[PDB]
């Protein structure tokens, strides 16, 4: 059996995480099991770096007016 965290999101972010898995942008292949087209199963010990990467992607193409 596998223990971790299920992440549900749009297919765009799911495939972005899939690309991060193969690109080794975090240092390892911690994206272990893909279960659905919109759901993934990732180990929980590095959810923070994934959140940081998602935030960077989101605010990169944002052009904050501040």
């Amino acid at each position: 059996v596998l223990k971790g965290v299920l992440i549900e999101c749009d297919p765009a972010m799911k495939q972005f995480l899939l690309y991060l898995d193969e690109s080794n942008a975090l240092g390892k292949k911690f994206i272990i099991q893909d279960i659905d087209d919109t759901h993934v199963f990732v180990i929980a010990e590095l959810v923070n770096v994934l959140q940081e990467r998602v935030g960077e992607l989101m605010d990169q193409n944002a052009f904050s007016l501040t």
């Binding site: 749009d10 297919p11 765009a12 087209d37």
Partner: protein
Amino acid sequence: GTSSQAEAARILAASWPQNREDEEKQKLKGGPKKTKREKKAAASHLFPFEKL
């Protein structure tokens, strides 16, 4: 393929900004309309293709 149409419609129609708007709609709209003027304002601010 018959299933290809349904799969593409499911993926495209509800990819990012529907999987949370539909949830909010299902978890809301319990009370009645406050006033009829809200519908008038919505009709005035809505584009013609959103009225049909």
